[PDB]
């Protein structure tokens, strides 16, 4: 249904009150929703929680059972491993990710969840695989019998883009995924990474959402993040329950069919 989500794990009730007019889903890199809004408040607001299996550690049938019984009632999706191609994140070869996928698929089969691939991006340092398109080709080869409904991607570019479209470098990467793969896409983290001022991140966000809302191959997208320390000007929230100017732009931006 509605595409606009958030990648954040520390929502308060008041935070979700001000986001929920347009932010219809979120995830938090684990499989149980943020303590501040659980077990009922997010459900009463009608915001969807999407669980994740972040990585490959401590994973077997017993763990799959536990995760399936801990994910809340109402789940419909399950995200696969986070940035496995990065040594500093889930740190799995495409072959290892494919070999452990049965545990992820066992959770989704038990609970009736649609599956998002492990989420990839370009890696430049400490990389199992630098090239995200290659990683995914290799994963699908190694996971030939596996259920994967959607492809997970992360994009972080500079803020200036091309001509009047400050999001052109992000658009160009989505167009590469669209040519390299046929499955629908979830853009589970994005922001620009060079913002010299708030105005630079705001113009990038506005042009990015106009593209993502109107691109049918993007099923869902999630801004990084509610409160971020290390991506300059990327936070949406200030004080408890207060959107900042960037949050207001994210909530107010036009939506496709929704
Ligand atoms: Ca281990
Ligand atoms: Ca512009
Ligand atoms: Cl609650």
TrEMBL record:
GO BP, sorted A to Z: fungal-type cell wall polysaccharide metabolic process
Keywords: Calcium, Metal-binding, Signal
Segment of the intact protein contained: 99 to 356 of 361
Native source organism of the sequence: Sorangium cellulosum (strain So ce56) (Polyangium cellulosum (strain So ce56))
Disulfide bonds: 2-258, 123-127, 143-146, 159-192
Residues of the Asl1-like glycosyl hydrolase catalytic domain: 5-250
Example GO molecular function: metal ion binding
Record-listed Ca(2+) binding positions: 164, 166, 207
Name of the protein in question: Hypothetical serine rich protein
């Amino acid at each position: 249904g509605c595409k606009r989500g958030l990648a954040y794990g520390y929502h308060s009730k008041a935070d979700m009150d001000v986001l929920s007019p347009a932010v219809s889903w979120w995830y938090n890199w684990t499989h149980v929703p943020d303590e501040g809004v659980r077990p009922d408040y997010y459900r009463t607001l009608g915001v969807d929680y999407v669980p994740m299996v972040w990585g490959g550690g401590n994973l077997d049938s017993a763990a799959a059972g536990r995760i399936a019984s801990e994910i809340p009632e109402g789940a419909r999706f399950l995200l696969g491993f986070n940035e496995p191609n990065f040594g500093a994140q889930a740190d799995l070869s495409a072959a290892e990710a494919a070999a452990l996928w049965p545990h992820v698929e066992a959770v989704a089969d038990a609970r009736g969840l649609a599956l998002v691939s492990p989420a990839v991006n370009f890696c430049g340092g400490d990389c199992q695989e630098t090239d995200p398109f290659k990683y995914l080709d290799d994963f699908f080869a190694a996971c030939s019998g596996c259920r994967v409904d959607y492809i997970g991607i992360h994009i972080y570019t500079g803020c200036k883009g091309e001509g009047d479209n400050q999001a052109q470098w992000l658009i160009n990467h989505v167009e590469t995924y669209k040519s390299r793969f046929d499955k629908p896409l979830w853009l589970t983290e994005f922001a620009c990474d060079s913002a010299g001022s708030l105005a630079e991140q705001k113009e990038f966000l506005v042009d990015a959402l106009a593209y993502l809302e109107n691109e049918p191959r993007i099923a869902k997208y999630a801004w990084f993040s509610g409160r971020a320390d290390n991506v300059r000007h990327a936070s949406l929230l200030g004080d408890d329950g207060e959107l900042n100017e960037l949050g207001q732009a994210y909530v107010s931006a036009p939506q496709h069919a929704c």
